[PDB]
Coordinates of C-alpha atoms in Angstrom, one line a residue:
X1 CA 105.3 73.9 65.4
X2 CA 107.4 72.6 62.5
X3 CA 106.7 69.1 61.2
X4 CA 107.5 66.4 58.7
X5 CA 105.0 65.7 56.2
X6 CA 104.6 61.9 56.1
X7 CA 102.9 59.3 53.8
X8 CA 101.9 56.3 55.7
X9 CA 101.5 54.0 52.7
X10 CA 105.0 54.6 51.8
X11 CA 106.1 55.1 55.4
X12 CA 108.2 58.0 54.0
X13 CA 108.5 61.8 54.4
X14 CA 108.6 64.8 52.2
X15 CA 112.1 66.1 51.7
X16 CA 113.2 69.3 49.9
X17 CA 116.3 68.7 47.8
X18 CA 116.4 72.0 45.7
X19 CA 113.9 74.9 44.8
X20 CA 113.2 72.7 41.7
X21 CA 113.0 69.3 43.4
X22 CA 110.7 68.2 46.2
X23 CA 110.9 64.4 46.7
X24 CA 110.6 61.9 49.5
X25 CA 113.2 60.1 51.7
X26 CA 113.3 58.0 55.0
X27 CA 111.6 60.2 57.8
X28 CA 114.8 61.6 59.5
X29 CA 113.4 64.1 62.1
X30 CA 116.9 65.8 62.5
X31 CA 117.2 66.6 58.7
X32 CA 116.1 70.2 58.2
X33 CA 115.3 69.6 54.6
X34 CA 112.4 67.6 55.7
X35 CA 111.0 70.2 58.0
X36 CA 108.0 72.3 57.2
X37 CA 105.7 74.8 58.7
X38 CA 102.8 77.0 57.9
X39 CA 103.4 80.8 57.5
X40 CA 100.1 81.9 56.6
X41 CA 96.4 80.8 56.6
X42 CA 97.4 78.7 53.4
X43 CA 101.0 78.5 52.6
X44 CA 103.5 75.8 53.8
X45 CA 107.2 76.7 53.7
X46 CA 110.3 74.8 53.6
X47 CA 112.4 75.3 56.8
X48 CA 115.6 74.6 55.1
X49 CA 115.1 76.7 52.1
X50 CA 112.5 79.5 53.3
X51 CA 110.4 78.9 50.0
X52 CA 106.9 77.9 49.9
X53 CA 105.4 74.7 48.3
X54 CA 103.6 75.7 45.0
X55 CA 102.5 74.6 41.9
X56 CA 103.0 76.1 38.3
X57 CA 99.2 76.1 37.5
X58 CA 96.0 74.7 38.8
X59 CA 96.2 71.7 36.5
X60 CA 96.2 67.9 36.7
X61 CA 99.7 66.2 36.9
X62 CA 102.0 69.2 37.6
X63 CA 105.1 69.3 39.7
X64 CA 105.0 70.7 43.3
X65 CA 108.2 72.8 43.9
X66 CA 109.4 75.6 45.9
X67 CA 108.4 79.2 45.0
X68 CA 109.1 82.6 46.8
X69 CA 106.5 82.8 49.5
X70 CA 103.7 85.2 48.3
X71 CA 100.4 85.8 50.0
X72 CA 98.4 86.6 46.9
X73 CA 99.6 83.7 44.8
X74 CA 96.6 81.3 44.3
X75 CA 99.1 78.6 43.3
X76 CA 100.7 78.2 46.9
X77 CA 97.5 78.2 49.1
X78 CA 96.7 74.8 50.4
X79 CA 93.9 73.3 52.5
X80 CA 92.9 69.8 54.0
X81 CA 90.0 67.9 52.6
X82 CA 88.5 64.8 53.9
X83 CA 91.0 64.2 56.6
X84 CA 94.5 63.3 55.3
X85 CA 94.0 65.1 51.7
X86 CA 96.0 68.2 51.2
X87 CA 94.6 70.0 48.2
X88 CA 95.3 73.1 46.3
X89 CA 93.0 75.9 47.4
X90 CA 89.7 76.0 45.3
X91 CA 90.3 72.9 43.1
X92 CA 90.0 69.2 43.7
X93 CA 93.7 68.8 43.1
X94 CA 96.0 67.1 45.4
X95 CA 99.4 66.9 47.0
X96 CA 100.7 63.6 45.7
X97 CA 103.7 61.2 46.1
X98 CA 104.3 61.1 42.4
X99 CA 106.3 58.1 40.9
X100 CA 109.8 57.0 40.8
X101 CA 110.0 58.5 37.2
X102 CA 109.8 62.2 38.2
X103 CA 110.8 61.4 41.8
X104 CA 109.4 64.9 42.4
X105 CA 106.1 65.6 44.3
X106 CA 103.2 66.1 42.0
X107 CA 99.7 67.8 42.0
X108 CA 97.0 65.2 41.0
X109 CA 93.3 64.6 40.7
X110 CA 93.4 61.4 42.8
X111 CA 92.4 61.0 46.3
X112 CA 93.9 57.6 47.0
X113 CA 96.5 56.6 49.7
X114 CA 99.4 58.4 47.5
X115 CA 97.5 61.6 48.2
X116 CA 96.9 61.3 52.0
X117 CA 99.4 63.0 54.3
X118 CA 99.6 63.3 58.0
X119 CA 102.2 65.0 60.3
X120 CA 105.1 62.5 61.2
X121 CA 104.8 61.1 64.7
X122 CA 101.0 62.1 64.9
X123 CA 97.8 60.5 63.7
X124 CA 96.2 63.9 62.6
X125 CA 96.3 65.9 59.4
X126 CA 98.6 69.0 58.6
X127 CA 96.1 71.7 59.3
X128 CA 96.0 70.5 62.9
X129 CA 99.2 72.5 63.7
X130 CA 98.0 75.6 61.8
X131 CA 99.4 79.0 61.7
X132 CA 99.0 81.9 64.1
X133 CA 100.2 85.5 63.7
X134 CA 102.9 86.2 66.3
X135 CA 103.0 89.7 67.7
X136 CA 106.5 91.0 68.9
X137 CA 107.4 92.3 72.2
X138 CA 109.4 95.5 72.8
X139 CA 111.7 96.3 69.8
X140 CA 110.9 99.0 67.3
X141 CA 108.0 97.6 65.2
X142 CA 105.6 98.5 67.9
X143 CA 104.2 95.0 68.3
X144 CA 103.9 94.1 64.5
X145 CA 103.8 90.5 63.7
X146 CA 106.9 88.5 62.5
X147 CA 107.4 88.0 58.9
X148 CA 108.6 84.8 57.8
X149 CA 111.0 84.4 56.1
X150 CA 113.0 87.4 56.8
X151 CA 116.5 88.4 55.5
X152 CA 119.2 89.4 58.3
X153 CA 122.6 90.2 56.9
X154 CA 122.0 88.5 53.7
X155 CA 120.8 85.2 55.1
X156 CA 117.2 84.0 55.5
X157 CA 115.7 82.9 58.8
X158 CA 112.7 80.6 59.0
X159 CA 111.9 81.1 62.6
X160 CA 112.8 83.5 65.4
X161 CA 116.5 83.7 66.0
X162 CA 119.1 84.7 68.4
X163 CA 121.5 85.7 65.5
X164 CA 123.5 88.9 65.7
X165 CA 123.0 89.1 69.5
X166 CA 125.1 87.7 72.3
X167 CA 122.4 87.8 74.8
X168 CA 120.6 84.9 73.3
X169 CA 117.2 86.5 73.2
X170 CA 114.7 85.5 70.2
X171 CA 113.8 87.9 67.8
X172 CA 112.3 88.1 64.2
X173 CA 112.1 90.8 61.6
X174 CA 108.5 92.3 61.0
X175 CA 109.1 93.0 57.3
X176 CA 110.7 90.4 55.0
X177 CA 113.9 92.5 54.5
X178 CA 115.2 93.3 57.9
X179 CA 118.5 94.6 56.3
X180 CA 116.4 97.2 54.7
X181 CA 113.5 98.5 56.7
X182 CA 115.3 97.5 60.1
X183 CA 112.1 96.6 61.9
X184 CA 112.3 94.0 64.5
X185 CA 110.9 92.8 67.9
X186 CA 111.5 90.0 70.3
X187 CA 109.4 86.8 70.0
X188 CA 106.8 85.7 72.6
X189 CA 108.7 82.5 73.4
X190 CA 110.7 80.9 76.1
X191 CA 114.5 81.7 76.2
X192 CA 117.1 82.4 78.9
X193 CA 115.7 85.9 79.9
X194 CA 112.3 85.3 78.7
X195 CA 110.8 85.7 82.2
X196 CA 112.5 89.2 82.8
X197 CA 109.8 90.4 80.4
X198 CA 107.3 89.8 83.4
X199 CA 106.8 91.6 86.5
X200 CA 105.9 89.0 89.2
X201 CA 103.9 90.5 92.2
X202 CA 105.7 89.4 95.4
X203 CA 102.5 89.2 97.4
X204 CA 100.2 87.1 94.9
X205 CA 102.8 85.6 92.7
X206 CA 100.8 86.7 89.6
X207 CA 102.8 87.8 86.6
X208 CA 102.3 91.0 84.5
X209 CA 103.7 92.2 81.2
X210 CA 103.5 95.9 80.3
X211 CA 103.6 96.4 76.6
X212 CA 103.8 100.2 76.5
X213 CA 106.0 100.6 73.3
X214 CA 103.4 98.7 71.2
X215 CA 100.2 99.8 69.2
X216 CA 97.7 97.2 68.9
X217 CA 93.9 97.0 68.4
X218 CA 92.1 95.5 71.4
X219 CA 91.7 92.1 69.6
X220 CA 95.4 91.9 68.5
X221 CA 96.4 92.7 71.9
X222 CA 94.3 89.9 73.5
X223 CA 95.9 87.5 71.0
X224 CA 99.3 88.4 71.9
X225 CA 98.5 87.7 75.6
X226 CA 96.7 84.4 74.8
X227 CA 99.6 83.1 72.7
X228 CA 101.9 83.6 75.9
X229 CA 99.5 81.5 77.8
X230 CA 98.2 84.7 79.5
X231 CA 95.3 87.0 78.9
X232 CA 94.5 90.8 79.1
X233 CA 94.7 92.2 82.6
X234 CA 91.8 91.7 84.8
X235 CA 91.8 94.0 88.1
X236 CA 90.0 92.1 90.7
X237 CA 91.1 93.6 94.0
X238 CA 92.1 96.9 95.5
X239 CA 95.7 95.4 95.8
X240 CA 96.0 94.5 92.1
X241 CA 94.8 97.9 91.0
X242 CA 97.4 99.5 93.4
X243 CA 100.3 97.3 92.2
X244 CA 99.5 98.1 88.5
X245 CA 99.3 101.9 89.2
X246 CA 102.7 101.7 90.8
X247 CA 104.1 99.8 87.8
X248 CA 102.7 102.3 85.1
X249 CA 103.3 105.5 87.2
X250 CA 105.9 106.6 84.6
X251 CA 103.6 106.2 81.7
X252 CA 101.1 108.5 80.1
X253 CA 99.7 106.7 76.8
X254 CA 96.6 104.3 77.3
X255 CA 97.0 100.5 77.6
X256 CA 94.5 98.0 76.7
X257 CA 93.1 95.8 79.5
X258 CA 90.6 92.8 79.3
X259 CA 87.4 94.7 80.2
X260 CA 84.9 95.1 77.5
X261 CA 81.2 94.9 76.4
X262 CA 81.4 92.9 73.3
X263 CA 78.8 90.4 74.1
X264 CA 75.6 91.9 73.2
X265 CA 73.3 90.3 75.7
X266 CA 75.4 91.3 78.7
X267 CA 77.4 94.1 80.1
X268 CA 81.0 94.8 81.3
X269 CA 83.0 91.8 81.6
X270 CA 86.5 90.6 81.8
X271 CA 88.1 88.7 78.9
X272 CA 89.4 86.0 81.2
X273 CA 86.1 85.5 82.9
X274 CA 86.9 86.9 86.2
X275 CA 83.9 88.5 87.7
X276 CA 83.6 92.2 87.1
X277 CA 83.3 93.3 90.8
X278 CA 85.9 96.1 91.3
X279 CA 85.3 99.3 89.3
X280 CA 87.8 102.1 88.9
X281 CA 86.4 104.4 85.9
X282 CA 87.8 107.6 85.0
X283 CA 85.1 110.4 85.4
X284 CA 82.9 110.2 82.5
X285 CA 83.3 106.5 81.9
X286 CA 81.9 104.3 81.1
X287 CA 80.4 106.4 78.3
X288 CA 77.2 105.4 76.7
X289 CA 78.3 106.1 73.2
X290 CA 77.8 102.8 71.3
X291 CA 81.1 102.4 69.6
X292 CA 83.3 102.4 72.7
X293 CA 83.3 98.8 73.8
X294 CA 87.0 98.2 75.0
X295 CA 88.6 99.5 78.0
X296 CA 92.0 101.2 78.3
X297 CA 94.1 102.0 81.7
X298 CA 95.2 105.5 81.6
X299 CA 98.6 105.4 83.5
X300 CA 98.9 109.2 83.2
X301 CA 95.7 109.8 84.8
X302 CA 96.2 107.5 87.9
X303 CA 95.6 104.2 86.3
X304 CA 91.9 104.7 86.2
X305 CA 89.8 103.3 83.2
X306 CA 88.1 104.6 80.0
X307 CA 86.2 102.7 77.4
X308 CA 87.3 103.4 73.7
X309 CA 86.9 102.1 70.3
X310 CA 88.2 98.6 70.1
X311 CA 90.3 99.6 66.8
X312 CA 92.6 102.1 68.5
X313 CA 96.2 101.2 68.6
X314 CA 97.5 101.3 72.2
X315 CA 99.9 99.5 74.3
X316 CA 98.4 96.6 76.4
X317 CA 99.0 94.7 79.7
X318 CA 99.1 90.9 79.8
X319 CA 98.5 88.8 83.2
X320 CA 99.6 85.4 83.9
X321 CA 99.2 83.3 87.0
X322 CA 96.9 82.0 89.8
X323 CA 97.0 84.0 93.2
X324 CA 98.6 82.4 96.2
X325 CA 96.4 84.6 98.6
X326 CA 93.7 82.3 100.1
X327 CA 90.3 84.0 100.7
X328 CA 89.4 84.9 104.2
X329 CA 86.2 82.8 104.1
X330 CA 85.2 79.8 102.1
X331 CA 81.7 78.9 101.6
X332 CA 80.4 76.3 104.1
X333 CA 79.3 73.0 102.4
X334 CA 75.6 72.2 101.9
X335 CA 73.6 69.1 103.3
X336 CA 72.3 66.9 100.6
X337 CA 69.0 66.1 102.2
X338 CA 67.7 69.8 102.6
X339 CA 64.1 70.4 104.1
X340 CA 62.5 73.8 103.5
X341 CA 59.9 75.9 105.2
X342 CA 56.6 76.4 103.2
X343 CA 56.9 78.2 100.1
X344 CA 60.7 77.8 99.9
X345 CA 62.5 75.8 97.4
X346 CA 65.8 74.1 97.5
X347 CA 68.9 74.1 95.3
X348 CA 72.2 72.9 96.4
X349 CA 71.6 72.8 100.0
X350 CA 69.7 76.1 100.3
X351 CA 66.3 77.1 100.3
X352 CA 65.2 80.3 98.2
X353 CA 62.1 82.3 98.1
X354 CA 61.1 85.5 96.2
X355 CA 59.4 88.2 98.4
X356 CA 56.9 90.6 96.5
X357 CA 54.3 90.9 99.4
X358 CA 55.6 94.3 100.2
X359 CA 58.5 96.2 98.5
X360 CA 61.4 97.4 100.8
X361 CA 64.5 99.4 100.2
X362 CA 67.6 97.2 100.1
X363 CA 68.5 97.3 103.8
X364 CA 64.9 96.6 104.9
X365 CA 64.9 93.6 102.5
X366 CA 68.1 92.4 103.8
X367 CA 66.6 92.7 107.4
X368 CA 63.7 90.7 106.5
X369 CA 65.7 87.9 105.0
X370 CA 67.6 87.6 108.2
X371 CA 64.7 87.5 110.3
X372 CA 63.6 84.7 108.3
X373 CA 66.9 82.8 108.7
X374 CA 68.8 83.8 105.7
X375 CA 69.9 86.8 103.6
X376 CA 69.8 88.5 100.4
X377 CA 70.7 85.7 97.9
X378 CA 74.2 85.3 96.6
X379 CA 74.8 83.8 93.2
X380 CA 78.1 81.9 92.3
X381 CA 77.3 79.9 89.1
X382 CA 75.3 80.2 86.0
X383 CA 73.5 77.0 87.0
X384 CA 72.4 78.7 90.2
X385 CA 71.2 81.8 88.3
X386 CA 69.3 79.6 86.0
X387 CA 67.6 77.9 88.9
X388 CA 66.5 81.2 90.4
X389 CA 64.9 82.6 87.0
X390 CA 63.3 79.1 86.4
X391 CA 61.9 77.6 89.6
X392 CA 60.9 80.5 92.1
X393 CA 58.3 82.1 89.9
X394 CA 60.6 84.7 88.5
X395 CA 59.1 86.9 85.7
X396 CA 60.9 88.9 82.9
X397 CA 59.5 92.2 84.2
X398 CA 60.7 91.6 87.6
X399 CA 63.2 94.0 89.4
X400 CA 64.2 92.1 92.8
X401 CA 67.0 92.9 95.2
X402 CA 70.0 90.5 95.6
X403 CA 72.8 90.6 97.9
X404 CA 75.5 92.2 96.0
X405 CA 76.5 95.8 97.2
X406 CA 79.6 98.0 97.9
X407 CA 78.2 99.5 101.2
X408 CA 81.5 98.7 102.9
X409 CA 83.9 99.9 100.1
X410 CA 82.5 101.8 97.3
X411 CA 83.4 100.5 93.7
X412 CA 84.0 97.0 95.3
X413 CA 81.1 94.7 95.3
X414 CA 80.7 91.9 97.9
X415 CA 77.9 89.5 98.8
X416 CA 75.9 90.5 101.8
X417 CA 76.3 87.1 103.1
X418 CA 80.1 87.1 103.2
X419 CA 80.7 84.6 100.5
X420 CA 83.2 85.4 97.8
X421 CA 82.2 87.1 94.5
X422 CA 83.1 84.3 92.0
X423 CA 80.6 85.2 89.4
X424 CA 79.0 88.2 87.9
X425 CA 76.3 88.6 85.2
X426 CA 75.6 92.2 84.3
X427 CA 72.7 93.3 82.3
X428 CA 73.7 95.3 79.1
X429 CA 75.0 98.6 79.9
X430 CA 75.5 97.6 83.6
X431 CA 77.1 98.5 86.0
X432 CA 76.7 102.1 85.4
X433 CA 76.6 105.3 87.4
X434 CA 78.4 104.6 90.6
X435 CA 79.7 108.1 90.2
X436 CA 76.3 109.5 90.9
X437 CA 75.8 108.0 94.4
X438 CA 78.0 106.5 97.3
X439 CA 76.1 103.2 97.7
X440 CA 75.6 100.8 95.0
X441 CA 73.0 98.0 95.4
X442 CA 72.1 95.4 92.9
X443 CA 69.0 94.1 91.5
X444 CA 68.2 91.1 89.2
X445 CA 66.0 92.3 86.2
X446 CA 65.0 91.2 82.6
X447 CA 64.3 88.0 81.0
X448 CA 67.5 86.6 81.6
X449 CA 67.8 87.4 85.4
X450 CA 71.1 89.7 84.5
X451 CA 72.2 92.2 87.0
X452 CA 71.9 96.1 87.3
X453 CA 73.3 98.3 90.1
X454 CA 71.4 101.1 91.3
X455 CA 70.8 103.3 94.3
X456 CA 69.8 101.4 97.4
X457 CA 67.0 103.7 98.5
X458 CA 64.3 102.2 96.3
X459 CA 61.3 99.7 97.3
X460 CA 61.7 96.6 95.5
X461 CA 60.7 92.9 95.8
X462 CA 63.8 90.8 96.7
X463 CA 65.2 87.2 96.8
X464 CA 66.3 85.4 100.0
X465 CA 68.3 82.3 100.3
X466 CA 68.6 80.6 103.8
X467 CA 71.5 78.7 105.3
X468 CA 72.1 75.0 105.4

């Protein structure tokens, strides 16, 4: 994420010569003095010197030099303007080439070519590479973010290091003076041994990372997974729950997983957009108390789930990988010219119709769909859900049976027509109260056609979808 700062007009690059001299030289990508990187939302640090570029004051024609990095100093905060302009934050003054008299780099009112900078090698500005907090793994800092620069054995370190360690793992101090506070962690980056931080499941090849020594909020936890090209754990199959129950059987403190109700207009959902089709709540969850929108896996209570306040500082599980297990059935393709019986309307090779003639409990409804040559409808895309609520005479106060249910295995929803569950859109507060029955059927209700699970023993209208 390092870079050289490059001036196209001069075809030359910024070079740090001393804490009191920042100049330019020929663009040498192997010269550390010309290497720079963001270390916060607004500061840019010299890799060679571990000091941030700054100005003595927000005033015209002053020298830009290296200062001790400081998150509160208005005089080291930078931002990109126009495109290639790099300006001190809050004022129309700009990182400028200077002149052969100073040789130094200068702050200046002028927005010409001498004030316009892009990342060497690239054609995009400096804010394109940007800065992200980097949460540590294992270590004693409980997952705190790296602090750049940091002091280790009276030496300063610009990025993560394998110094003071013969195993070669990459670490960082989480306060600037590691020699004093002694707080560290391992960096979420590739190195020989990096992968032994993951448990790969031999059945599916999906990888899992159990961060039980950490205390992050839900949102912090999610960002630590995302920066590892992963995401918070989704639990989509009976097997996956079981593998994870095994992996955490020795733990007791809760661990964040990706299940949340943060979107207002809908209900429970996985942060990786997996369908929410396998349920494993602890008794008394999900609780309806309004602050508890993020879900934790409780390894000390058999790896069942509970929703908590998203600000609690727990451990977390990340999940990386695509499963090798093919599904048993794949949906059969459609037939682009589809003819439909009377009062049935096509979409994507299937005909649909809403029944409200006489309400039936879910089983009688499903029976009537099959006497008519189809089933209770399955839904696999938001496009398909939009078709149903738009083109079939659907009304916002409707409550209609669809094919989702867990009559085979409770807590595991399947489509009555046997197609895989690729997509779920739960109503706000749904699904709920599977603990109060043994069969969960699923209706479509509300202005948006979102789904609620309920008891199957209830007379309702229903939606049928025939075959191709």
